[PDB]
Structures are given as structure tokens and as C-alpha cells.
Design a protein around this nucleic acid. Sequence first.
DNA 1: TTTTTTT
Lengths: 650, 114
Amino acid sequence: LSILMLHDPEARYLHKILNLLPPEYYVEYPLWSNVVFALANTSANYRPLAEWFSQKCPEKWNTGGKEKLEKLWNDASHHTEKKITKRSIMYWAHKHAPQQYKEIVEQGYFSILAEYVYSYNGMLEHYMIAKVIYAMMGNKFVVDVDSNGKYVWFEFVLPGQPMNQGEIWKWRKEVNPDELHIYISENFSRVMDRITEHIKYHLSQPHESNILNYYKKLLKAFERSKSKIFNDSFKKGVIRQAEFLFRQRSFIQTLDTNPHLLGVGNGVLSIETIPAKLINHFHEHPIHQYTHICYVPFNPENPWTKLLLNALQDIIPELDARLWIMFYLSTAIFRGLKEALMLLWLGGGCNGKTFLMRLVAMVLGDHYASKLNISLLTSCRETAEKPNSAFMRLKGRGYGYFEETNKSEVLNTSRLKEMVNPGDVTARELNQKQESFQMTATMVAASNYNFIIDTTDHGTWRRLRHYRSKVKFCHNPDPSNPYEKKEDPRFIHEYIMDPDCQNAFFSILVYFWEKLQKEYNGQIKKVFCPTIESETEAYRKSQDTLHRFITERVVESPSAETVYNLSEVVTAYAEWYNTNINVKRHIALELSQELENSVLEKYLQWSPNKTRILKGCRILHKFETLQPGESYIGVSCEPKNKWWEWSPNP
Amino acid sequence: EAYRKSQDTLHRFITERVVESPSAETVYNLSEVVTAYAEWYNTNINVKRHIALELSQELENSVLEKYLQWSPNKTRILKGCRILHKFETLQPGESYIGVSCEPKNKWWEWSPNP
DNA sequence: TTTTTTT
Ligand SMILES: Nc1ncnc2c1ncn2[C@@H]1O[C@H](COP(=O)(O)OP(=O)(O)NP(=O)(O)O)[C@@H](O)[C@H]1O
């Protein structure tokens, strides 16, 4: 409600006096209305009755009796014979508690400025008006020192302001306090004028003995010093001195650290509790970054929401795969520690990639999502003192997507383990110091052919997920093929640029995040989808070349007198891999311990020369050459016009 | 100790590819051993470059000393001890050359003087 | 501190 508006410190000044009033006005009709009438006589702008509602009880005297007091305030605001001044309010405050009244009024802005003026004979300096400005404007601005050692200003943005779009109810960064400078030459000038009038009143008093010459000297000196408010160097010195008063010591390091708060175009979205709420009023959460998308609650009757849900049904035909992909993409709005997962999307031609992943990126914005290049995953890493500015593009963001594949790229598994696990990553920002941060990103890679996984350890395969698109988008040549559908170019040209479509998709993402938090305990491994698991299993078995070599080249041989040791089969694997993907020089010791388990452990035996003397299992080492014996060693409901709420099985 | 024994590739090469051939006239200068060990290391261990001289000193400091002798031309030679040069193909005679508590209540604290 | 140029 902002009962004490930050643009008017006299509301806070008057609220202190209303607290200072005796509690006999609390829970009573007549004198409460008398003070309301007096306060409306002094200033009728809905401020002092709001302060009455805040400090004391709003309607405890009569529930539903607000409108009677509103009508009384209206009658006070109209022409009123009686006109009670504010001096009656000061008289009542002094009557209730004189010492408390005095102690309350020493901390006001006018008393601080008047004390400075009287104690320094009208000579005003930088720290004095900096202190007054901090007293009257200290809740709207903040100062902190960044990593480079510079003092940076931050301003809280209110609805009525020349504001960049999406900045409301947040802290915006300022290289200079633009508003404070104007405030000094405007609002502060007004209070200076009030002090001038007070000095004129004290001049209008009788001469007494010698105080009148002192008063004219004070008036002359203050009139000389009053012009310094509009001087550029004086204002610069005032702002420089105000940096030590507006300073908050741990503001920048706290600035975007709550992962349950998300800056959005109409305020701050809080996903701490279900349902998620929209803070569009004053608050104390430090929020700087935001997205341009405004948060509206999820409503399927919206035409854009209906269009987007139909599009989602078009892109992914399987219901369980659609639910899993939506649950996975919903975790992109969270910027905390999440599970070590990675999704690979494979599509032949015109598919839903670059529409869905780019939609997530555009609804999250530049601060919360980013597009990443495939050189971070495929090429070998650089020496860490080089400032990799592409690796710094996932510091404080919860979503990342790769989009480029040259020709069946082979990804570096060390980079995969580095960029997926919930741990710390060390890298150097360009022209900056080497630093460590936390991995909080949900990652999706879209490919056109495939990815080659060289390793077969449990570490890289417990964090890899694979999906293949089953829908081809060919509008002109759309045959009876069910998986074949006619396309609209608008989805890539107009719908992805439309703010209403982005708002609807963000609402869908928030709804699916809440669904994941409700049905499961936010854990995505409990999402039971057989299609994704089966596709990952098939992809893993395709990438595992050990079993393919053992089933293809190694055959059962009855009564075989030939002896095949580990160097022979390692060289056979070397020539097989020469006929496979690429040259791929490897380590023979690790290949020996890797085929140590394999599936030949049943037939493998020990040698007197502490070696491996595996008998039988003659390799073909050519094409065909079939064994005359036998055997092989390698042992060779859809949603009913409704979804996004489906949960009979869970 | 087990890891240091398993990381000694020269001992493994001598055990695997060098066998005590009795009454063998096979002449094996350090260069032959260096080449054989280099292939053995690259084939069994990770392929990597080797220093011929350093390798000669390495193989020199081993059981080879027993069967390693100077030549009339002052050249290190391995008397007999035919090398396998391939899988099996070992000398049966004279066999090969390469020899072939409980926490009770709390575990954080223990015997100060075991 | 980068660009570089390490190569
Ligand atoms: N649900 C949908 N319904 C109709 N048309 C769609 C839908 N999703 C995408 N399209 C269209 O499909 C076309 C293919 O574009 P795009 O999605 O970028 O292809 P892509 O597979 O992602 N990338 P690429 O395979 O290299 O061409 C675009 O013109 C979209 O407008």
C-alpha cells in the first residue's frame, strides 16, 4: 500500500507524530474523527488517515466503519467553516509526552537542518545537507562498493517514474544518483525556503537587547549559502559525501542470491510457496535483474495458452515424453542447485527445435538464460588463465541451450562432468580476476545427426538424456503421414516475438514447475517416462562399441587350440576402431582393464606367467569367415483432449 | 608397495617377453632389449616416446644384469635368454627370467601407542 | 588486461 510514500518524507514525519499521539484516540470514534478533520485541514491527500490506519487500529472501533470515516474526510476536504491547524496536533503531542515529543522531533529533517544552520551561523557545507538528504531520502537509494573498488548507486523504482520497461519494484543500477541531484535543486530548495521563513519570523520578534543584529547576520549568511544548492561542484561534493551515509555493506553480494525470487515485468514473482505470488508493492528483497515478461496466472482458456498447448501437443506426440520435457524445461526458472541432468534433442529436418528452446530462452531473458556455443562441449579445453568469456555466460542463469553441430561432433566428457554436476566451476572473466561460481543451469542441446560418447563409465551416463523428434514439419508437401504436419512460419517469425505468447508460455512454465513441486518432491528422476528411458538405453547401447565388437568379431570355437591374449584383442579393437569413427588414439592399459569386466570374464582365465591366456574365442580378423561350430560369446494412454494435469498413475 | 610394483612396466616386460633359454646362443645387445621394451610399453602401456640411452640404463639396472655381459668389442649383450618376440613362444627350459583392526565403540579415537 | 602471440 506504501502507507509512508518514499516520494514524500513528510508522510513519515507525520506518522511519527501520529504514533506520538496518546492511545486514547486508539479504538474510539469522536476525537479520532477530530484529529482526522484537523489533519485533512492541514493536508487532504489521503496520507494522514492512512497513517491513522497504519499506526493505530483501522476499524477495530467499528468493523466495516471505514466508509463513515471516508465520508467525514470528504466533508473535511470540502469547504469547512472550522479550520484546525497542525499546531493543535503538536499541542496534543506535547500534552501526552513532552520528552517523547522532543526526542521524536530531533530526528526530523527540518530539525537537523535548522540545528546546523543555527549552530554554524548559516554556513552550510557538504556533509550537513548530505545528512539531511539521507534523513529524508534514505529508503529509496543505496550505495555499495563493487569488485573494482568503485561506489555504485542503486535506486528503488516506484510506479510513477520515468522508468525503463520492466524495472518496477526493483533496484536499478546508477553510475550517478540522477534523481538525488534534481531532488537537491528542487525538494531540498523548498525546505531551505521554509528555514528562510523561520528566520524571518524570528527577525519579526522584538529587538530585545542585541539579538536582532545577530539575526540579520544569520539571514544574510543563509541567503548567501542558499544559492550553493544549484552549483555543480557543491552538488558533486554533497553526493560524494552522501556515499558514506547511504552505504550498505553487504548489498551487492546479496543482490541476486535468492533462487525463489524472479524479477518480472510487473514486479517480483515469488515461487517460495504454492501458489506462486506476485509482489507488486514495496518489499525488502534485493532484486536487480529481471525479465521483460509479465506474470499472469496459468489459465488454459486464454487463446494464446490454448495455441501454445496445442503446439506442444504437435511437437511431442508421446504424452509421457511431453510431460517429462515440460517438467525438465520448467526447472529453468529455478537458479539454485539442481540435479545433474542433460538433455540431447535430435531432429532430422524442420522440427520443434529453435522454437521451443528459443521460446524458453526468450521468456527467461538475457539475465536468466543464454545461448551457448558447441565449442564449450566438443573442443578441447583451453589453459585456465586465458579469460574464457564464453564460459562466463552461465554464471547466474538457470537455462542454457546449444544449437550447432558440424558433422556428428564428439563431445568432451570432462566438460560434460564439469558443466552438469552441482559443484563449483573456476573461470576467469575477461580483464578480471579468476573466480569460482556455482553451476545452476538446465542445459539442452539440439543436434542434426548425433553425438559420439567415447566413454562408457557410469559417471557420464547417469547425467545424459536423449530424445528424438518424431514429427516432420513440411507444410507444402504434407502427406497422409500422421507424424507429418503442415507448418506455419509464424511460429518462428511472429509468435516467438509476440509478448502475449511469451507471457502465456511463461505461465505454462510456472504451472509445470508447481506441478513438479506438488506431485513429486521437485525431483525429476521420479518422473516415470518409459519413452525417454528407452531412447537413452538404445542410444547408450549404440554408443557402447565394446559389446558390438564382442558380438561381431569374437566367436565361440569348440576345441580351439589357439591362444588369444589381451594385446591381440586390444590390437584387433584398434584396427576395428580404425575402421570405426576416427583414428582415436587411446590407452591400451585402460582398454585392458575395461575389457577385463566386459562379457568375456566368464571365459577369461589366468596364466602361469601372471598374464591373461584366454583360450578359444578366435577372432575373425576379416570379413565373413564363419565358424563351423556354433554359439556366440556376446549372447546374441494418450490424453483425451486434455493434459498438463494428467496424473492417474502418480 | 602394490601400486609401485604394478607401475613398474620394465619388470612386467622382462617377466612377459624374456624367458631363460638354456644353452641359447641368442645375442641381445641393449638396443634389441630397448626396441622390444619400447614396443611392449607402447603396445601394453600408453604409446609414448622413449630415450634409447635412458632405456638402456633402465633395462641394464634389472635381473638382465645376471644374463647381461660385455662383448669383446665392449658392448652390453644378453647371453641366451631368447626373447618371445610374440605371444607364447616361451622357452620351457629353465622357465622364464622374470620371477613369476575393528572399531569397538567409537572409531574417531584409537590406540595412542598401538 | 586485453589485443596479442604463444604456435
Ligand atoms: N508446432 C508447430 N506448428 C506448425 N509449424 C511449426 C511448429 N513448430 C515449428 N513450426 C515451423 O517449423 C519451421 C521449422 O523451423 P525450425 O523450428 O527453426 O526448424 P528446426 O528444425 O528447429 N532447425 P533446422 O532443422 O536446422 O531447420 C518454422 O518455420 C516454424 O514456423
